[PDB]
């Protein structure tokens, strides 16, 4: 059965830093963008919406715009990686990564931000 | 863009009655069982795991085992229909139906159970 996995299901980070939430999925030989879908959401806020290689700035929630990107370099090697930069205390919470690729699966990732000084 | 739709996001049903939760996806004609995944969750309790035709009925909350069924007769009309016979008060809460077909989407449905006397 297709099982997405999370190396680290608990990221503690510092206010203002850079964070990279990883989700991994199985890839045999190369990666087929046809039949790959990657969706990242926090508390129902749309963070990453990647469908057969197309993405649209218009659908990103306003608190994640210009900070939250899906790294395409890791994707090619089975790693849906969310990278939030300039982290706010408001980014603390449970995130879900939902992948369709051979089959489907999702995983929760928890994040706390410790506060400045 | 592939979108899942609920004719109703909230159902009020009576203790002891039968209830069908419906969530619809688009279908051209020949249902490609090979391209279809239907997953039903209730508070993260795996209810339905239906993947390329086969149900891993191993993992199915015994809370619903033999009472929570995927009507695999409406799927062909683009209706992932969850039916729970003999509704207990425990069946009250938020259900989530996740479909991967052309692409992918999910929707929440709430169930309020009442028991008039
Ligand atoms: C204009 C337009 O309206 N368009 C789109 C509009 N929205 C944009 C959008 C746009 C897009 C693209 C998307 O994609 C999702 C997506 C992406 C990728 C995959 C899936 C998906 C599809 C089918 C099934 C499943 C999940 O199956 C399973 C889950 C399972 O269980 C996982 C699990 C269970 N329990 C706890 C955890 C944890 N932790 C994990 C298991 C069993 N396990 C694995 C197997 N065995 C082992 C060893 O594990 C099996 C299946 C098949 C998923 C995630 C989904 C839904 C979702 C989208 O909106 C979501 C959304 C946003 N806001 C509000 C609501 C509401 N209401 C909904």
From Swiss-Prot, chains A, B:
Highly expressed in the heart, skeletal muscle, placenta and lung. Weakly expressed in the thymus, spleen, kidney and liver. Expressed on activated T- and B-cells, dendritic cells, keratinocytes and monocytes. It is found in: Cell membrane; Early endosome membrane; Recycling endosome membrane; Nucleus. Residues 2-110 form the Ig-like V-type domain. Induction: Up-regulated on T- and B-cells, dendritic cells, keratinocytes and monocytes after LPS and IFNG activation. Up-regulated in B-cells activated by surface Ig cross-linking. Disulfide bonds join 23-97. Ubiquitinated; STUB1 likely mediates polyubiquitination of PD-L1/CD274 triggering its degradation. Ubiquitinated by MARCHF8; leading to degradation. Deubiquitinated by USP22; leading to stabilization. Interacts with PDCD1. Interacts (via transmembrane domain) with CMTM4 and CMTM6. Interacts with (phosphorylated) STAT3; promoting nuclear translocation. Interacts with CD80. Plays a critical role in induction and maintenance of immune tolerance to self. As a ligand for the inhibitory receptor PDCD1/PD-1, modulates the activation threshold of T-cells and limits T-cell effector response. Through a yet unknown activating receptor, may costimulate T-cell subsets that predominantly produce interleukin-10 (IL10). Can also act as a transcription coactivator: in response to hypoxia, translocates into the nucleus via its interaction with phosphorylated STAT3 and promotes transcription of GSDMC, leading to pyroptosis. This is Programmed cell death 1 ligand 1. The chain holds residues 18 to 134 of 290 of the full protein.
């Amino acid at each position: 059965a297709f099982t997405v996995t999370v190396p680290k299901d608990l990221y503690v980070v510092e206010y203002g830093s850079n964070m990279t939430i990883e989700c991994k999925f199985p890839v045999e030989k190369q990666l087929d963008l046809a039949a790959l879908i990657v969706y990242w959401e926090m508390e129902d806020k749309n963070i990453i919406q990647f469908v057969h290689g197309e993405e649209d700035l218009k659908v990103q929630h306003s608190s994640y715009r210009q900070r939250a990107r899906l790294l395409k370099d890791q994707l090619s090697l089975g790693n849906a990686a969310l990278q939030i930069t300039d982290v706010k205390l408001q980014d603390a919470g449970v995130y879900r990564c939902m992948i369709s690729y051979g089959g489907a699966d999702y995983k929760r990732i928890t994040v706390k931000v410790n506060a400045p000084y």
